[PDB]
Design a protein around this ligand. Sequence first.
Ligand SMILES: Nc1ncnc2c1ncn2[C@@H]1O[C@H](COP(=O)(O)OP(=O)(O)NP(=O)(O)O)[C@@H](O)[C@H]1O
Length: 301
Amino acid sequence: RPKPLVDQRVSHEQFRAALQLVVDPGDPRSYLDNFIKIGEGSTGIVCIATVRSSGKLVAVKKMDLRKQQRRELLFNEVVIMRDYQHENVVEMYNSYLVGDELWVVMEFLEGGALTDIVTHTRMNEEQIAAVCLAVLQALSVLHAQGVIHRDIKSDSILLTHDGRVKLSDFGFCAQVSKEVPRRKSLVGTPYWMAPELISRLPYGPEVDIWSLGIMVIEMVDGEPPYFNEPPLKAMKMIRDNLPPRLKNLHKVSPSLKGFLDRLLVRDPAQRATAAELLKHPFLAKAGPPASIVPLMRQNRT
Ligand SMILES: Nc1ncnc2c1ncn2[C@@H]1O[C@H](COP(=O)(O)OP(=O)(O)NP(=O)(O)O)[C@@H](O)[C@H]1O
């Protein structure tokens, strides 16, 4: 799997001191048991744990401070989830600092990543629409406050046991305001990266819309475009070539096709916004959380 990409006393100790003030005080082990690793990411490992009193399950993301790509991005993990409590957003209960590590205590998502489902089986339009709705609902709220996710991919999308979709992995979030027009840093996963971002030109919230476009290709075709190619020239191909098309538009309804045509636009000014796309006819096909349950590993094949 391709890993997410981003382009000392005073340095460390000051940064630690900063995070100390941001997070909740104390240590989570005073009420949590059985820290067992689930999977490693880019920022660090995610592991499971139990509430000692109730017996209920939580997740704990552990991120090392001195083992970061770009330290200052760790603030996102705390803040984004703190502020934007939304139906389609992973809940954060608490954040703590332990030694050289940040420990964010968030909700455990049973269904796992959307990556797992995209590669193994391949969903129908009803289910694909259900996902896109859930992501766009979340992304509209973030874009409303001028917050770019910067890392939209199947890996970022997680599920509950009852098939509800939530967005996660906010470690690459950007801020844009009245005085800050666009960002300009090379951030995200290589394949899901927008064309203007790969050319290092100033980019806005639109790079998420494109990223979702690529994530649509994922659900339909199993892979993002050029996934077989090495990331280096795969990014150059996105920068040079026309917008990637689907395998064959034969079984694809014109509803979905016209939807994706708004997502994968080269010129970001013409590219549709999260607000618009919420009213696109394709999202009317979106099935209930129940219709996603069959896709999950436990009930698959
Ligand atoms: N609360 C959760 N419950 C279950 N699985 C999770 C949870 N959070 C993350 N995961 C999965 O654990 C895997 C490893 O962590 P990952 O999300 O890759 O970290 P990461 O890449 O550092 N995120 P980012 O903040 O974007 O850098 C991911 O692929 C997720 O699918």
